[PDB]
Write a protein that binds this ligand. Structure first.
Ligand SMILES: O=S(=O)(O)CCNCc1ccc(Cl)c(Cl)c1
Length: 658
C-alpha cells in the first residue's frame, strides 16, 4: 500500500521540525510502519529522530520516539502515563555513521503491529529487535498526542533529545507491513554480510572473522559460528567458511570446517537481560579461534582452531595437563573411561584404545573423526538441544542419536578437560574440509596447550615454510612446518607479560624477515621481528600512535603488494581507543629500508570514533582492493552481548586510506 505521509531532505541542525499539520490527521488505526532514510555522522550523545507526543503541561511522559545514541544504538520509547505504559526497546551497535569519509544513509524500518502485539525494528536490512507485549500500545493511541516532530521530542513545549543529522526520506503507513514487504525496501548499505543469522550454519551469532586470499584468486573466510550467544567457550561453537570468486562481491553459502554434533545446531535468540544474559551452553564440545594459511607446494589450504571438550573453556581448562602421555618421544591422547577416577587409557597408532594400568589393548578403537568404535561397531550418544522455555536455560536430550565422540559429555571415553589445537585441510580451496586432527603438545607432557592466534598463518614467499602464531603465558609460540603441515616444530619467543591474551599476526617485510604485531595488556600494540624465517625472534617493542584498552583487542595485518609513496607498505587493522573497542582504523605504515622501522603515516577512520570495532580480518584482494571483515560492535562490553549480524564486510581502495 501507499504511504499516508511522505517527506524528505530534512536537515536536523539542533532544531526540531514540526510536521504535525502534515501527519497527525493522517494517522489511523492501531498498526503503523515508519520507513526512514537518515544520516548522522556527527550525532549528539542521545538524540531523537522522530517523535509523536502530547506536548501539554503534565503529560511529559506521553510520547513515542525513535532515538539513537552516539554509540550507534537505535531504539524506541512508547509511553502513556494514563495507561501506565513505559516501553523502551533498543539494540546497541545497529547504525553506520561514515564510510570512505562520507555520511552513510541508514535505512530504518519500524513496524508497530497491533494484531500480533509486536514491535519490530530493522536497520540496514537487519532486524535488531522484535518485541511482543501483553498490553499493546498503538503509537498514535497515546493520550493527548498533539505533535509530530523530526529531530526532537516535544515535551511540555520544549525540545528534548535534539538531533544533529538529516532525514533524506521518511514515509509512514497505516499498516504493519510484512517481513516480505520489508525485504523489498531498497537499501544503501556500505557493507555486506558473508555470515548471517538464518544461513546454513544456523548459528544466530558470529565472532572471530578471518580472511585469506588464495593463489587462484578465490578469497576465503573463516569464523566462529557461535550458537549460545556470543560467549567464548564454554558454549557450542563450530568453525564455518565461505569463499568469494569475484573479489568479495558475492560469497558462497557457508560450510563447516570444524563441527561437533553432541548438541543440535540451533538458531537461538539469546537473552540480553541482566538476569539471563550470562546463561551459557555448558555441556557442549566446541571450537574457537580459527586461522588460515595456503601451502604453495601441495596447493592445500590449512585451517587450525582451538578445540574444547564438553563444558570446557580457557577458564576451566586443565592448566597442568597437555592431555597427552609421552612414550619414547611420542605422544598419545589420554582417555578416561566411564567410572574410573583417573585416565587409564591412551589412543595408540591406528586409533587402538590401549589400557595403561595393565598395558593391555582393548576392543575399543577411535576412528579418524575421534568417534568411538567397539569391535568395529560405532557407538552413539543422544544429542542435546537447548531452550529457555522454563524461563532459564535447559539443556536436554532430543531423541536423536549421533556418533559417540571422545570430546562429548555423554561419551564412554573422554579426553582430558583442557584446550587442544586441531588442524584440517582442504584440497579444493574451501569447497570441503577434511576431518580434523589434533596437533601434538609442543611445550611438554605437563603443560596445557597454547592458544591459536586467530586470523592468518604465514606462508613465506621464498620457501615452503608455514607458520602459525600461538600464545601461552610468558611467550608467543610459533608453530613451524616445512612439509605442508605434516609435521610441526615450535619456536618460542619470550614476551614481558604473564597471562596475556597475546593474539599475534605476522607480515613478511621482505624475504625471511617477519614482523609480528600483537595484543598486550599495556594499552599499546607490540611487535617483534625475526630475520631467519621464524627461527629466532627480537625483543619486544611497542607502536606509538595507536591506543588500545588495557585488556587489548586482536590486531590484523598484511604486507601490501604495491609500493606507497615509493615505499614498501604494511596495513594494520585495529580499534584506536583507550576506552573501548570502537574507533576502528586501518593504519598504513611505510617501511624504512635502512632499518626496517615503520612510519605509521596514514590512519583511515573505518566509521565514527564512538562506533564499535573489535576483532578484524584484512586481506589484499586480487584486484589490489582491501577486504575487511570485522566485528562492528564492542565485543568486550557486557551491554553488547548477543547481537545478530554485526560481523560485516567492506571493500576499500588504497586511495580511500591515504
Ligand atoms: O574476550 S575477548 O578478548 O573478546 C576474546 C578472547 N578469547 C580468548 C580465548 C581463546 C581460547 C579459548 Cl578456549 C577461550 Cl575460552 C578464550
Amino acid at each position: 500500500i501507499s504511504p499516508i505521509f511522505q517527506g524528505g531532505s530534512y536537515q536536523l541542525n539542533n532544531k526540531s521540525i514540526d510536521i504535525s499539520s502534515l501527519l497527525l490527521d493522517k494517522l489511523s488505526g492501531e498498526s503503523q510502519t515508519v520507513v526512514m532514510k537518515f544520516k548522522a555522522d556527527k550525532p549528539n550523545s542521545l538524540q531523537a529522530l522522530f517523535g509523536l507526543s502530547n506536548s501539554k503541561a503534565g503529560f511529559k511522559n506521553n510520547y513515542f520516539s525513535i532515538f539513537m545514541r552516539d554509540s550507534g544504538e537505535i531504539g524506541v520509547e512508547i509511553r502513556d502515563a494514563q495507561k501506565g505504559i513505559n516501553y523502551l526497546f533498543s539494540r546497541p551497535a545497529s547504525l553506520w555513521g561514515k564510510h570512505k569519509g562520507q555520511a552513510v544513509e541508514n535505512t530504518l524500518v519500524f513496524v508497530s503491529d497491533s494484531k500480533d502485539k509486536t514491535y519490530t525494528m530493522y536497520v540496514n536490512g537487519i532486524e535488531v529487535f522484535s518485541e511482543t507485549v501483553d498490553t499493546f500500545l498503538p503509537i498514535s493511541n497515546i493520550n493527548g498526542i498533539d505533535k509530530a516532530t523530526l529531530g526532537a521530542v516535544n515535551r511540555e513545549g520544549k525540545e528534548h533529545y535534539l538531533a544533529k543529522g538529516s532525514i533524506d526520506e521518511i514515509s509512514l503507513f497505516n499498516k504493519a507491513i510484512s517481513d516480505q514487504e520489508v525485504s523489498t525496501i531498497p537499501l544503501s548499505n556500505p557493507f555486506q554480510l558473508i555470515f548471517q543469522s538464518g544461513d546454513s550454519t544456523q548459528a544466530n551469532y558470529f565472532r572471530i572473522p578471518t580472511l585469506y586470499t588464495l593463489s587462484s584468486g578465490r578469497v576465503l573466510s573463516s569464523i566462529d559460528a557461535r550458537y549460545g550467544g556470543t560467549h567464548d567457550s564454554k558454549s557450542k561453537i563450530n568453525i564455518a567458511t565461505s569463499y568469494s570468486d569475484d573479489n568479495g562481491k558475492t560469497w558462497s553459502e557457508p560450510i563447516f570446517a570444524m563441527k561437533f554434533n553432541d548438541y543440535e545446531e540451533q538458531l537461538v535468540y539469546w537473552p540480553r537481560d541482566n538476569k539471563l544474559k550470562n546463561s551459557q551452553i555448558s555441556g557442549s564440545a566446541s571450537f574457537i579461534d580459527s586461522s588460515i594459511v595456503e601451502d604453495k607446494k601441495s596447493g592445500k589450504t590449512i585451517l587450525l582452531a582451538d578445540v574444547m571438550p564438553a563444558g570446557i573453556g580457557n577458564n576451566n581448562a586443565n592448566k597442568a595437563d597437555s592431555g597427552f602421555k609421552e612414550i619414547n618421544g611420542h605422544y598419545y591422547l589420554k582417555l578416561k573411561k566411564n567410572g574410573d577416577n583417573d585416565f587409564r587409557y591412551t589412543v595408540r597408532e591406528n586409533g587402538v584404545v590401549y589400557n595403561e594400568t595393565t598395558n593391555k589393548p582393548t576392543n575399543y578403537t577411535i576412528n579418524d573423526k575421534y568417534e568411538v568404535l567397539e569391535g568395529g561397531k560405532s557407538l552413539t550418544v543422544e544429542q542435546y538441544s537447548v531452550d529457555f522455555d522454563s524461563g532459564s536455560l535447559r539443556e536436554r536430550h532430543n531423541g536423536k542419536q549421533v556418533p559417540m565422540n571422545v570430546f562429548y559429555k555423554d561419551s564412554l571415553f573422554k579426553v582430558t578437560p583442557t584446550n587442544y589445537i586441531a588442524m584440517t585441510t582442504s584440497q579444493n580451496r574451501g569447497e570441503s574440509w577434511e576431518q580434523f586432527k589434533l596437533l601434538p603438545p609442543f611445550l611438554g607432557e605437563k603443560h596445557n596447550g597454547t592458544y591459536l592466534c586467530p586470523g592468518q598463518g604465514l606462508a613465506l614467499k621464498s620457501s615452503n615454510r608455514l607458520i602459525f602464531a600461538t600464545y601461552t603465558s610468558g611467550e608467543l609460540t610459533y608453530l613451524i612446518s616445512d612439509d605442508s603441515g605434516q609435521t610441526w616444530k615450535k619456536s618460542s619467543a619470550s614476551i614481558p607479560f604473564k597471562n596475556a591474551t597475546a593474539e599475534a599476526q605476522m607480515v613478511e617485510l621482505r624475504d625471511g624477515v617477519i614482523r609480528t604485531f600483537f595484543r598486550t595488556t599495556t594499552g599499546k600494540i607490540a611487535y617483534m621481528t625475526s630475520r631467519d624465517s621464524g627461527e629466532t625472534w627480537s625483543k619486544v617493542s611497542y607502536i606509538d600512535g595507536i591506543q588500545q584498552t588495557s585488556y587489548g583487542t586482536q590486531v590484523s595485518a598484511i604486507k601490501y603488494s604495491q609500493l606507497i609513496d615509493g615505499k614498501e607498505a604494511v596495513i594494520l587493522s585495529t580499534p584506536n581507543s583507550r576506552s573501548g573497542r570502537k574507533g576502528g582504523q586501518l593504519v598504513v605504515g611505510l617501511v624504512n629500508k635502512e632499518d626496517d622501522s615503520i612510519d605509521w603515516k596514514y590512519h583511515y577512520d573505518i566509521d565514527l570514533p564512538s562506533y564499535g570495532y573489535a576483532y578484524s580480518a584484512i586481506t589484499e584482494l586480487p584486484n589490489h582492493h582491501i577486504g575487511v571483515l570485522f566485528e562492528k560492535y564492542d565485543s568486550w562490553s557486557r551491554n553488547e552481548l548477543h547481537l545478530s549480524n554485526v560481523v560485516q564486510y567492506i571493500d576499500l581502495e588504497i586511495n580511500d586510506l591515504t
